[model samples]
Target: MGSSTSTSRATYMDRFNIPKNHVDLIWDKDGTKSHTRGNTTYRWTERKSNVGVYVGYSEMYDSSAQAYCQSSSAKIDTKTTVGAPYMAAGACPNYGKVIAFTKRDGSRSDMTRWKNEIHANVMPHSTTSCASRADPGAAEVAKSIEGFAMYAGYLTHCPYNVNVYRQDMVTDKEFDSTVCNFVTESNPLRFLDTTQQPYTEYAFHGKGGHKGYDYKGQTSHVGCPPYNPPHVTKGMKDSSWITGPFECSILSRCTTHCWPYKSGGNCFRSLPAMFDMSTGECRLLGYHTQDFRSSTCAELTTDDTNAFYCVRPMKTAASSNMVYVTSHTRPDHETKCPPREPLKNVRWGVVSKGKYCKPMNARASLSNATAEQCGQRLFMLSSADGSSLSSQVRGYHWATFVATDCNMGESCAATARGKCFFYSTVPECLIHSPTTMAFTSLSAVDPSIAIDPDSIAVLPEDKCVSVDCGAHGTCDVATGKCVCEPGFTGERCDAAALVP
Candidate 1:
């Protein structure tokens, strides 16, 4: 078996500042009591057309008279009715109780009336009740401060809980929580007082108001205040000293055109009649100190020294320029300037002067040849004795001619003793023939000194009277054949010499 007894009361009733012994009073829509409990006699009165609910209770006599005497009464709650013009508790949700009578214009009388009627009479014990009297200047005060609003509970009221979420009052839009100045400042209503006038530097241009300049004259007064320097001004006319340009003089040294000349000196002179290349006229360039060796008289007497004064046109000048006689001559520049004579063409087995010029076929004798014919200009020479003739033709000679530029179709002449033959190609000359005997000698007068046994003859096949066997060995005088050496084989001994 289980037995349980429970007693409960409304949690909202405990939120009010009522006596501990007081009982809950229930009333109907009319100004009449519905039911009541406990030893006290109670009355429920509807004021302001049921807009306000008041509880009036009295102590009853136990014996004899049995009459009820009024103990005390107070406003419990205020509501909104359809036709009522008075301020209700619902209008001031944050207030605990209304203090003074709200005027017909809906304004509270004064703090004195609030202290007497509401604080002393209605809810004497309530501390927060002073807020019930609406200050006449509240709206103007709130207007003076930006983002200020008297929202809800400032009066003698029970704990009123309200959650408000809105955009920033100034910008009227959402912004970042950390950067939203309005949301940060107005989170607590006390911060509204700090939003007073002169929010920024009033006299400056960038902060509070007017910009500095305008489109027309005398717009000065219309624009922002004039710029004022933070220091005292020093007047010009009244001062002893005057401001003027500060002049200075600097001494510098001369620069050299050549490395050996003095780079820094004052012993130079300026020439006014230098020639300009671009304009093709004389202009003032400059001059320099001279060395004795560079004198024209010294060079005129002797040609033995490497050093001499030379006057030539300056190719790098902006105008048609001429060089003056100066000691500071650049040897390297003088050597390369005006360009040297073009190289001459030479070939092997021929005597000539100077290094060879190329395309190899560009020799004076072969310059008119076709591209294909010029490509075949190399030759192999032989002598009766083992002598080379490449040195006979010094500089640009037949031997110094570049062979790689010659083509396969061209032929080169080979000499043996006093005889010479122009071969058809390289392989036909060197590989097929072995001993018609050719040699080279350095003697310019006798280019073919002695017979070289190993030298191959490179004559055309149509020119051979009989079976030449490529002239590899001794030709059989009877059969017009070749007798190859012991180690040599093949018809002309053109194959490898077999070793035993």
Candidate 2:
């Protein structure tokens, strides 16, 4: 926002006690509020004094009426004097003071003279000389009294300290010279200028010559006439390969039932063949034969004449048993399958038959077994001699069994005492290995065996091989060394440095 003054003509007039009467007689009747006296007219006209401070003055006649009313110094009352008091020089003291005020032109009373004086003082460089400069052209439209008064009022009360040099309407010699060059050189409107010049003969430099004035000797310039060059095209050799369709069209199958049949009794009576369009070769799609007995009976065959048969038996040996015992083996049988050699001595019974087997004596393998048979002997000691069997063993079982040797022997005896084995001594029945038993029996043990030596073995007290540094450090892989980052220090990089 630019700063502006709010002073007006009414304020200046009231402050200076300038009268507001009969201003319409002598002030220029320009088309604006400052030219007249009315409700809508400006009260004062803006003027910059010789000292450059903006000021305002009220409009009044150039001469006072007192001089016109009196004849001369010798006469007090003359017939030539006007009788109207309003026309008298002393009729209004405030009005007389404004007319007597001296302007920048060393003149008094004339509003036009005052305006010119103010303009010259404020904008000294606007003209070459005071005598040569003419007045601005008269306003096209006449001004009303009220309009003139309003403008005068604004000027008197809110006179602004305007920078006239920064205004767009103000121009300099540089602007005029540049405009003249553009008009005379490149503009078609140059013909409008009536200034005549000579036409050269042999040199061909004339008013109507093909070459006009060249301002800067360049093809392009600001405000220059449009000049465009023609465009040209030339042919080049082709460099493309593989011109035809890039994608190959694949042939669909001859039949919807393409391959391996799911539910099958139908045997293939004929085969299919296809012709390759690219290679121009014939391909054979072989036939399929099926057995009526098998669930998945369809089978692909190169011999199209092979016959399919359904010689399925009514009952197998497993389905012919009379006893209704559920076997631990395949459940298609009616009776339990013979027990394994280790379990033959145990009394067995069945609870259900067909499609599934459930034996009552299945847990009997864990009872009536020696420490060795139970897979716990390496971790146990025989009651006959209190010696650790794990000491005599090596490999995987020795590594795992030594941890619970004699303790497991007594634990197993207690577990089987009242449940499956009634003997007071630890049975020779097979005990499921909690960990790997022997290297050879590693796969036969419980699936949860934690046999990783690194996890179970206790290293020496001084070792810190698995210790980790915090997020602010890196650990050396080979030497297990902690390298602390900046602002962090300690074995684990968990402590902040005192300075940081």
If scored against the real structure, what TM-score would every candidate get? 0.11, 0.11
- Writing each residue's lDDT as its tens digit, candidate 2 over 1-500 gives 11111122122212111112211111112422242212223122222111000011121122212222122221111011111111111111010011111222222222111111111011111123222332211110111100000000001010011222222101221112121221112321121122332211111001121111111112232112221211111111110211111000000111111111112111111111222222222221111110022322212211212222121101111111111100000111111111101111121111121111122222122333332334332111111111222242222111122113233323342222211211111111111323212111111112112122111111112122356787998775434578889989898898997872
Over 1-500, each residue of candidate 1 has an lDDT whose tens digit, in order, gives 11111011112112111112112221112435322222322233322111111111111111112111111121111111111111111100011111112222323322111111011011111223242432222211111111100111111111111222231112211112222221232332121122343221111000111111111112232212222211111111111111100000000001110001121211111111121122222111111111111133122122322222221111110111221211111112111111111011222121011111111122232333321122122111211101123322222211221223332112321111111222211111211122221111111111111112112211123222345565467655444466786767776776768666
Q: Global CA lDDT of candidate 1, please? A: 0.19
- lDDT of candidate model 2 versus the reference: 0.19
For model 2, state the Cα shift of residue 257 in Å. Answer: 84
Each model's lDDT: 0.19, 0.19
lDDT of model 2 at residue 67?
22
As a TM-score, model 2 comes out at: 0.11
